[PDB]
């Protein structure tokens with residue numbers, strides 16, 4: 042049964058644009074990371090009290106996330122149709138999706154070799170213990186690692202990866218959007234591109250229900266987003282926390 046319509050010229054153009062956008066905004070050598078405030082790892086083999094007292098990994102990770110938010114803003118601006126949205130809707134979509142797109146894009150550095158995000162030598166290898174040294178708890182971290190492994194195991198083509206990040210950003214069901222119908226039309230154009238790509242271009246057996254597995258990952262991201270936000274709120278009560286973050290991070294997550 043399953044018909045396999047060919048990608049339209051327009052859909053091929055969308056894919057080309059998104060790939061180019063990603064290649065321009067995601068440096069796979071991590072060569073800027075030496076510009077961030079340095080990673081510091083206090084001895085904490087056991088402690089929430091110590092973690093909050095020092096927040097040793099927070100300046101480095103806040104700089105990494107802040108940099109990544111900048112990159113995602115750039116990426117978003119290149120999504121076909123995004124600039125047709127009002128400025129207010131653009132900003133609502135970016136602020137609401139930022140953490141989720143950071144989680145998706147990080148999958149590229151994530152490695153199942155040792156369940157880390159590996160971005161160079163030891164200094165820029167991030168493990169669960171680094172995230173706890175930035176003031177988060179295992180209610181966020183363990184589902185985050187489970188999410189990274191589940192995504193890695195879909196073995197997405199880069200085309201599918203960039204479409205998934207675009208679909209995440211252009212979501213009509215974010216609080217505070219004004220033109221939900223326009224956002225939905227943009228998202229549907231991207232979703233249709235993805236569905237078509239998978240059916241034409243993704244060999245079996247990895248194509249089996251791949252679209253539905255990808256839409257499930259979007260739902261998973263909502264849950265992580267909510268948990269991150271709850272934890273960020275608590276982290277923000279720590280005196281002097283603001284100096285360890287950045288203005289962009291404070292705005293997006295405040």
Ligand SMILES: C=C1CC[C@H](O)C/C1=C/C=C1\CCC[C@]2(C)[C@@H]([C@H](C)CCC(F)(F)C(C)(C)O)CC[C@@H]12
Pocket residue numbers: 099102103105106109143144146147148149150151158160167172175177269273290
């Ligand atoms: C962000 C990327 C993209 C480029 C590389 O691929 C490396 C990479 C890794 C992303 C990583 C590895 C380090 C921990 C990160 C940043 C997670 C952490 C829960 C964010 C916490 C926070 F948001 F920083 C804060 C403010 C303390 O709340 C979310 C994504 C994770």
